């Protein structure tokens, strides 16, 4: 299959804050992900890091390994350093047959932390926009030619939340870096999905396609609420849930028409005592496969 569905176990346990579905075992979010009809699932933190042990987890269960996030450091260190950081992840793809590494720059990102507003979050200044793109296209180069395709997640809480900051990292790079596509990150930062789609669709390597619970938005704008508060009350839900506000048919129609091949992957970080995963996943990926349907994405 040229278009695969995949989940991301954050939605049992947390990586930014690790008590959030601490309860849940690394088998009963592997097992629930085969279950519900997943073809592969994300890293997670409770995810086995050598290549035989996440093979001995994932295969018996039909998983593919989608990829792994990866932290940049590249305000704070060099281009070369940042080679050395990123290699052990790229020789972990590769092993598992991935053809795809994430990656945000999270040196000065505040998701993490819960004390911390997300109106103070970091913003980059105009002038480093130039070096900070040659970094991130160095280090995209890099694993290019080992394979690997590099895709910038834009994220709340970081230096790239915005879309007129999606388009300056665009605009700063390229050709090999591409962009990974979060719809949920990318209307909470008060961007427009579909519009974003339009202008780098053609640069767009892999898609998340999480929804907003848009009451809750507006309680983290009107209270000045953390990241990881907002995840708490919610503010993160999945494809075909009515609470939420993002128009996923479109942005599916946009990729239908420029030939994407790659992931969908539903990611919804939620509360999981209250937001049960087996069910909300289960909506997520049923309605993503519709909504891909309706687009002419998936035939
Ligand atoms: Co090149
Ligand atoms: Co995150
Ligand atoms: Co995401």
Redesign the pocket.
Same mark, same amino acid.
Request: charged content about 25%.
């Given at each position: 299959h040229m278009i695969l569905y995949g989940t991301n176990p954050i939605a049992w346990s947390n990586d930014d804050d690790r008590s959030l579905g601490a309860h849940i075992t690394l088998d009963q979010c592997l097992d629930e992900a085969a279950k519900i009809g997943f073809d592969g699932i994300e890293k997670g933190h409770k995810f086995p890091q050598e290549a035989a042990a996440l093979k001995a987890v994932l295969e018996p269960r039909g998983l593919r390994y989608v990829s792994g996030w990866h932290s940049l450091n590249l305000l704070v260190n060099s281009v070369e350093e940042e080679k050395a950081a990123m290699q052990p992840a790229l020789d972990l793809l590769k092993a598992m047959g991935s053809k795809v590494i994430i990656v945000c720059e999270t040196s000065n990102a505040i998701h993490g932390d819960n004390d911390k507003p997300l109106q103070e979050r970091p913003v980059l200044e105009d002038a480093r926009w130039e070096a900070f793109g040659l970094g991130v296209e160095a280090l995209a $180069?890099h694993a $290019?030619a080992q394979g690997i395709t590099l895709v910038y997640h834009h994220h709340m809480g970081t230096i790239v939340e915005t879309e007129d900051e999606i388009d300056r990292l665009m605009r700063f790079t390229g050709?090999?870096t591409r962009l990974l596509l979060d719809t949920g990150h990318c209307l909470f930062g008060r961007g427009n999905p579909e519009r974003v789609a339009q202008k780098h669709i053609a640069r767009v390597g892999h898609i998340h396609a999480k929804n907003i619970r848009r009451d809750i938005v507006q309680d983290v704008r009107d209270q000045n609420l953390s990241f990881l508060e907002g995840v708490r009350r919610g503010v993160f839900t999945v494809p075909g849930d009515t609470e939420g506000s993002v128009d996923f048919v479109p942005v599916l129609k946009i990729a239908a028409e420029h030939g994407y091949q790659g992931w969908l992957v539903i990611e919804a970080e939620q509360d999981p005592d209250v937001r049960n995963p087996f069910e909300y996943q289960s909506l997520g990926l049923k309605s993503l496969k519709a909504f891909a349907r309706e687009a002419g994405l998936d035939k």
């Amino acid at each position: 299959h040229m278009i695969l569905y995949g989940t991301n176990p954050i939605a049992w346990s947390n990586d930014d804050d690790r008590s959030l579905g601490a309860h849940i075992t690394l088998d009963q979010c592997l097992d629930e992900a085969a279950k519900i009809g997943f073809d592969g699932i994300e890293k997670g933190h409770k995810f086995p890091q050598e290549a035989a042990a996440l093979k001995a987890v994932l295969e018996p269960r039909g998983l593919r390994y989608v990829s792994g996030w990866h932290s940049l450091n590249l305000l704070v260190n060099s281009v070369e350093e940042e080679k050395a950081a990123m290699q052990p992840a790229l020789d972990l793809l590769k092993a598992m047959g991935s053809k795809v590494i994430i990656v945000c720059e999270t040196s000065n990102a505040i998701h993490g932390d819960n004390d911390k507003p997300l109106q103070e979050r970091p913003v980059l200044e105009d002038a480093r926009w130039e070096a900070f793109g040659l970094g991130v296209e160095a280090l995209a $180069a890099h694993a $290019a030619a080992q394979g690997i395709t590099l895709v910038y997640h834009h994220h709340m809480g970081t230096i790239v939340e915005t879309e007129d900051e999606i388009d300056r990292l665009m605009r700063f790079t390229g050709p090999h870096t591409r962009l990974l596509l979060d719809t949920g990150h990318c209307l909470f930062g008060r961007g427009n999905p579909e519009r974003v789609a339009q202008k780098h669709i053609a640069r767009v390597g892999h898609i998340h396609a999480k929804n907003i619970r848009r009451d809750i938005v507006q309680d983290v704008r009107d209270q000045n609420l953390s990241f990881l508060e907002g995840v708490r009350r919610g503010v993160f839900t999945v494809p075909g849930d009515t609470e939420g506000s993002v128009d996923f048919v479109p942005v599916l129609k946009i990729a239908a028409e420029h030939g994407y091949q790659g992931w969908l992957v539903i990611e919804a970080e939620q509360d999981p005592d209250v937001r049960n995963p087996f069910e909300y996943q289960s909506l997520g990926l049923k309605s993503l496969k519709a909504f891909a349907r309706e687009a002419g994405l998936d035939k």
